[PDB]
Swiss-Prot record:
It comes from the Bacteria. This is Pseudoazurin. The chain holds residues 26 to 148 of 148 of the full protein. Its cofactor is Cu cation. It is found in: Periplasm. One of its GO terms (cellular component) is periplasmic space. Residues 5-93 form the Plastocyanin-like domain.
Amino acid sequence: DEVAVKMLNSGPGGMMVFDPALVRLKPGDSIKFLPTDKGHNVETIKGMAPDGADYVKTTVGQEAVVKFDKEGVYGFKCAPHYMMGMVALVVVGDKRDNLEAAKSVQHNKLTQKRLDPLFAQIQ
Ligand SMILES: [Cu+2]
């Protein structure tokens, strides 16, 4: 099945957010990222993906679909707004092999503060 996530200038958590910012999926699920507001994309954050997953880098302002097959923890950023904390976390299936790795990637203060509660909600 396919879950929609909106790319927003203003939403739950403040400026430059994905809503929802935490997505639980099953292997085979897809997300459709909706350009609610223009000027957003989705891109893998290196070190925040199970080994074998393809690198994602979408075109700014377009709807995009990402299908998920490998189980594990994925972190995605909005490229132009990463410094502004626009990030999301995707959990696929039950495998948590890459969790300690993904949680160990460092970020600016603002982005870190956003991820904290998401990680907390996966533990
Ligand atoms: Cu953005």
